[PDB]
Amino acid sequence: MIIYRDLISHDEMFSDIYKIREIADGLCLEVEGKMVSRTEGNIDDSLIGGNASAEGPEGEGTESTVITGVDIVMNHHLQETSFTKEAYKKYIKDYMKSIKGKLEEQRPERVKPFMTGAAEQIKHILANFKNYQFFIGENMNPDGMVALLDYREDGVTPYMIFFKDGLEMEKCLE
Numbered sequence: 001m002i003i004y005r006d007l008i009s010h011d012e013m014f015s016d017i018y019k020i021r022e023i024a025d026g027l028c029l030e031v032e033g034k035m036v037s038r039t040e041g042n043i044d045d046s047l048i049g050g051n052a053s054a055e056g057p058e059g060e061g062t063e064s065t066v067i068t069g070v071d072i073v074m075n076h077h078l079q080e081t082s083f084t085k086e087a088y089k090k091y092i093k094d095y096m097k098s099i100k101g102k103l104e105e106q107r108p109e110r111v112k113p114f115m116t117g118a119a120e121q122i123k124h125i126l127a128n129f130k131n132y133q134f135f136i137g138e139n140m141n142p143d144g145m146v147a148l149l150d151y152r153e154d155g156v157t158p159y160m161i162f163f164k165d166g167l168e169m170e171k172c173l174e
Contacts, residue, residue: 002171004029004162008098008144011137012170013162014072022164027117029167030159031072032152038067070149070158077138078147078160085129092122095145099166114165125161135160 004020005012014020019032044050044063051061072078083091096118103111125132125148135147148161 001173002169004031005168005170006137006141006144007102007166007168008095009137009139009141010168011139011141011144012076013078013137013147013167014076014160018072021159023161024117024121025113026164027113028121029162029164031162032157032159033070033072035068035156035158036071036074039065072160073135073149073158078135078149079138079140080149081134081136081140081146083134083146085126088122088126088129091146092118094143095166096122098143099145099163103165110165114163118163118165121161132161 002016003012004014004016014031021030021032022028023030044065048065049061049063053059053061070078096114100111100114100118103114132148132150135149136144137147145163145166149158150161151158
């Protein structure tokens with residue numbers, strides 16, 4: 001299988017184990033994950049919860065331990081950060097420049113589309129900043145790129161927006 005790591009930090013933000021869809025004409029890629037809930041397994045201990053009983057045979061403390069979230073975010077150790085509208089403007093220029101410059105040394109012929117696509121896609125998300133959230137690998141590199149986690153039309157299937165120009169691939173089976 002092939003992995004997907006940022007071009008700045010080289011951190012595998014995701015892999016080809018999910019449904020990746022190239023958007024913006026190959027500019028960005030949408031990684032389709034899946035929300036995994038947790039609340040099964042007849043087994044409770046002090047580690048998770050459980051109260052300290054002593055008197056009375058009939059007594060329940062109720063642990064209430066449920067875990068839910070995006071799979072890729074749990075396995076990729078994704079981290080959600082914060083950002084403002086104005087800050088994002090300078091953020092895009094700073095992050096897009098990091099990829100643009102690096103791309104200029106690798107595929108300078110692709111720096112042009114990225115310049116237009118970057119400003120285009122960004123303006124799109126900005127219009128829905130309240131819907132899109134900033135996510136980063138387990139490193140949370142501020143100088144790197146950002147992962148926009150959104151939900152499909154159904155609002156269930158969680159997908160993240162990744163930048164192709166600012167992301168590299170690597171085939172590693174073993």
